[PDB]
Write a protein that holds these residues in place. Sequence first.
Motif, short mmCIF file in Angstrom:
data_model
loop_
_atom_site.label_atom_id
_atom_site.label_comp_id
_atom_site.label_asym_id
_atom_site.label_seq_id
_atom_site.Cartn_x
_atom_site.Cartn_y
_atom_site.Cartn_z
N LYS A 28 -4.05 4.04 1.34
CA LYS A 28 -4.19 3.94 -0.27
C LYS A 28 -4.66 5.48 -0.60
O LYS A 28 -5.11 6.40 0.22
CB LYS A 28 -4.98 2.89 -0.67
N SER A 30 -8.36 5.86 2.87
CA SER A 30 -7.99 6.43 1.99
C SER A 30 -7.44 7.89 2.25
O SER A 30 -7.98 8.61 3.17
CB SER A 30 -9.31 6.79 0.76
N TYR A 58 0.79 -1.15 -0.09
CA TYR A 58 0.04 -0.03 0.12
C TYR A 58 0.91 1.16 -0.07
O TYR A 58 2.15 1.17 0.31
CB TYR A 58 -0.96 0.07 1.22
#
Length: 257
Positions: A145, A213, A111
């Motif tokens: 991410k 995120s 990631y």
Amino acid sequence: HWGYGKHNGPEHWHKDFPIAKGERQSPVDIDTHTAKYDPSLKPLSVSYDQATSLRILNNGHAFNVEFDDSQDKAVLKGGPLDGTYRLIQFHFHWGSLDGQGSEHTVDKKKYAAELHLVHWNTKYGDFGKAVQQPDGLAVLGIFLKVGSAKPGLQKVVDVLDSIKTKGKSADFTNFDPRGLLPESLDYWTYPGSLTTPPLLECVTWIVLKEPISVSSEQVLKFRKLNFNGEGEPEELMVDNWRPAQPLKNRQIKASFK
Ligand SMILES: CC1(C)OB(c2ccc(NS(N)(=O)=O)cc2)OC1(C)C
Ligand SMILES: [Zn+2]
């Protein structure tokens, strides 16, 4: 001293820290198909409502948001854990590019970054005593991410300009770590170690399956930090992650499916 460069990086650590080639080193690759659901796991409990952050520090390896752990606040328990573990600090590991940065990997997937919320077993009095025990620490790992921005991370991102170099710190009170947690608490767990020297094998790792995120802009600012101290040649703080280590005789347990 140790670092992440060509001459002092992960492949060099074993010389000053022999345990680097130990039996329960972290991080590790998480083979999702080999991980087995464990019904013996109790619900995971993350109680950060009373968490009290104190400051943020650039230690030349990463930046630490430190918390006041003199009282019973911000605790992790349940899951594979016995007793109560107290939050003491959190930091991240990230790459020079979005395609790398995490320490743990999932089916070899790397990631963009990884968040580590560090807790010590309260049965040991303090962090110092805890790291001398096989079950002294519990680190909650969360993958990052690149996509939508994480509102709760912005306060951290905006203070980074004030601790650009090694040794610099800044007041960082009233930061709520709950703003860095994903929706689901589904996780994988295994016995491991600190991923940075001294690499002590006192950690019960709890790695969440769902990543959070963060925006490209947010991680880009992480990459503006320096490994060096002020007045020294600039070395961007990037790729401060240790690669996957041998699993040896350990089994990764899943809290789901
Ligand atoms: C209390 C402090 C700040 O906390 B620690 C520490 C050191 C390394 C560490 N690495 S990792 N990647 O495994 O989470 C996680 C925690 O040692 C001390 C320096 C004693
Ligand atoms: Zn870490």
